[PDB]
Structures are given as C-alpha cells and as structure tokens.
C-alpha cells in the first residue's frame, strides 16, 4: 500500500519556511513580540544570542512587519582586536562578547557616560531596575531595556548563553533575570556561589584542564595568566567599544 499517492500531495499543507528549516520556534516567538495594545506600538527590543561551532553572535533586534530591524550586532571573532585570540567559544569568550555589545549600544545611544554598570567582576545576582520593578526609587532615569532570546537552545545551569547575559548586564544593560542558571548556583539550598561563578568567568577551569593535559602529555600557551589579559581585555573593551576591523 502506497500512502504518498497523488491525493496525498493535493491535500498537504506546508509549514512555515523557517519551521521546515528548523530555525525558528514560532510558539515562543509570538509571546516574545507580543505587547500591550494600550502602548500604541512603542519600540520593544530583543537580545538575540546564537552560538555556532566557531563563533558567538549577540544582536539587538526590534521587530517590524516589513522585517526585523537589527541594531548594534557584535561577534566573538572581533575579540583579537582587543587581545583574546584563543578559544573564542568558552564561557570567558561569551562574557566578553556580551560586554562589548552593551558598551557599543550605550555609546550609540549616547548614554555610556552614565549607566556605566559594575566594574569589579564578581558573581553576584543584585537586581535589575525596570519600569515595572522600581527597586525602590522611581524618579531616576531608567536604564535601556531588552529581553533575552535563546531560541532552541537547552537552558541548563552553567550554559554559555547565560554567560552572554551576565556580560551584558555588567555592561550596563537592563535585562530581567534570576541567578537560577549561573554555574555556581545550588538548587537544594537555593544559593549562588560567587567564587565558582567568577572562576568560570575568568576561565579558571580551562587553565586547569590545559595544565592537566600537559602533564598527561608527559609520559604518554601557558596558564596562570588567563585572568591577566581577560581583565586587560575588559578594560580595553570598556575603553574603545567602537573599534573594528576595517578593509
């Protein structure tokens, strides 16, 4: 018996193009672009984070009927312009690219002088001040806002997508979030370990693995300074976010 006969093709209804290609989850997309009708089409921004086999992409997008409009994208392959030329896909790299896009967005908006964000890097939740979450005062200027979008990625504790989120938050952007997914979080005591989070941010785990690899290489470039240029790269990014590779 043949099921794919002529009548089968007549009645077939094709799915959406980006659903056939397995790129867009429209069930989550509809809830993400939805906005209150009382606000008559006031802009709403998304923070799109995508990770390939060799690069990390962070974009700020505003949705329109004619097609989505992208403002101030950033890619992890521009890091060698600042002093990071290895890995480019680990947790440390994800933090750096999130910081770079936040500074670029703020500079373009002309608000980088204010909203400088935190400078000392540590794993601490703090909180995000939005219009619906005054966090006390409500008269000071409100920070620029965006909502995180992860697509089809699996959300687990210690995922690199949340590393991009932490970098953007520390850059000065206001993105609503909770510490439940940061690598140092323990769910049984519902607590977060600052030391664990900051270690992964500066790539402590990578150095230990690289060191151990060298030892096992014996009897079958150098660690202990990763925090060195990672801090130096942060200062360079906070100094000149707009510099790029021209050709």
């Amino acid at each position: 018996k043949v099921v794919k006969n002529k009548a089968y093709y007549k009645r077939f209804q094709v799915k959406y193009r980006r659903r056939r290609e397995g790129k867009t989850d429209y069930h989550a997309r509809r809830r993400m672009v939805l906005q209150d009708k009382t606000k008559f089409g006031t802009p709403k921004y998304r923070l799109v984070v995508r990770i390939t086999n060799r690069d990390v992409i962070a974009q700020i997008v505003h949705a329109k009927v004619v097609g989505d409009e992208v403002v101030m994208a950033a890619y992890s392959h521009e890091l060698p312009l600042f002093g990071i030329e290895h890995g480019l896909t680990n947790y440390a790299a994800a933090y750096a690219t999130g910081l770079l896009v936040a500074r670029r967005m703020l500079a373009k908006l002309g608000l980088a002088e204010k909203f400088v964000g935190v400078k000392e890097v540590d794993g601490s939740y703090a909180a995000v001040r939005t219009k619906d979450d005054d966090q006390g005062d409500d008269e000071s200027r409100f920070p620029f806002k965006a909502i995180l979008d992860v697509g089809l990625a699996r959300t687990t504790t210690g995922a690199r997508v949340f590393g991009v989120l932490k970098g953007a938050v520390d850059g000065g952007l206001a993105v609503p979030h909770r510490p439940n997914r940061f690598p140092g979080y323990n769910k049984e005591s519902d607590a977060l370990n600052a030391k664990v989070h900051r270690d992964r941010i500066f790539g402590r785990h990578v150095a230990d693995y690289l060191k151990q690899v060298r030892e096992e290489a014996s009897s079958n470039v150098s660690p202990d300074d990763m925090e060195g240029m990672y801090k130096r790269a942060h200062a360079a990014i906070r100094a000149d976010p707009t510099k790029r590779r021209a050709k």
Binding site: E21, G22, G151, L152
Partner: protein, 166 residues
C-alpha cells in the same frame, strides 16, 4: 572517502521473560552482570488472556551498549554461533541480529540461584554523519546514497569475519 566507512553504532540486548516477579529480578541481575551497566524494565501495552499478561505490567528487561564493550560483546556472540549466520538475518535498513539460547555459553560462571536464560542480540550499522537526523536544531534527512543498504551489510560482515549461508 575516508569517512564513508561502515561502523557499528550500538548493540542492543533484550531479555523477554513473562511474569513480573523474582524471575524478572534474577534476569535483571544477569543482564547487568554481562552488561556492567544498569538495565531498565519494560511494561506491556494490552491485556492478553492467551499470554496471561495485563496492561502496563513489568515483562522484559533490556539495555543498549556503545563503544569497545559493544565490539567485544558482539565478538562473544559470534563465537557462540561460530561466526555463522543465514541470509534472512539482514534487513534492508542495514542491520542484523541473532540469539543465544543459554546464557552460560558466553563465558559466565553459572550460579545455582539465578538460573539459565536466553538473550537477543541486535546490531545497528551506519556511516558517520547521521546526527543530522537526530540533532535538535536544523534536523534534516540523510542522503540516499549515504544510507546503508542490505548488500553492503553482508559485505561488511564477511570482511571482518565471513560465514554467511544463503
């Protein structure tokens, strides 16, 4: 092409006993012994008076193995069947299987408590790059020529170890 070769993906062992009592418990011990890996139980679907089983009742126990242990376990089974098979054992999908009647013959010290059981061996073969049909994002279909067919299956078998009777 270097990655057009045929490799063994996984080997699945299944023990289909009736009842849901100590017989099942002992069979699980035997399987986890030979498999050095935790097995899982299976439950029926319908209720059959002829077979004397009810819906969603523990019946069988099985496990799957990938890697070197899969390779050596396969070798032991073929040794029991003296590397001799039949023509009607390979599917057009590109897989084949067989079955031993006594679990003693694999080289396991008999224990007077567990008893003697029989098992089923199934081997799945495929080339490298089938993950396109299993990844979460941008799932597609493997190419037709890239798929493994039955004729290449026996040729692979004879290459490593012959002895197929048509």
């Amino acid at each position: 092409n270097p990655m057009r070769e045929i490799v063994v993906k996984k080997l699945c062992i299944n023990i289909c006993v009736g009842e849901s009592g100590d017989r099942l418990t002992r069979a699980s011990k035997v399987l986890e012994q030979l498999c050095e890996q935790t097995p899982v139980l299976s439950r029926a679907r319908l209720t059959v008076r002829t077979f004397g089983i009810r819906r969603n009742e523990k019946i069988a126990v099985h496990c799957t193995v990938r890697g070197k242990k899969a390779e050596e376990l396969l070798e032991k089974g073929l040794k029991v069947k003296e590397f001799e098979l039949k023509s009607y054992n390979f599917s057009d999908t590109g897989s084949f299987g067989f079955g031993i009647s006594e679990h003693i013959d694999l080289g396991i010290k008999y224990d007077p408590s567990t008893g003697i059981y029989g098992m089923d061996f199934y081997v799945v073969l495929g080339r490298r790059g089938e993950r396109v049909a299993h990844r979460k994002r941008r799932v597609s279909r493997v190419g037709f020529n890239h798929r493994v067919r039955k004729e290449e299956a026996m040729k692979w078998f004879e290459k490593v170890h012959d002895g197929i009777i048509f």
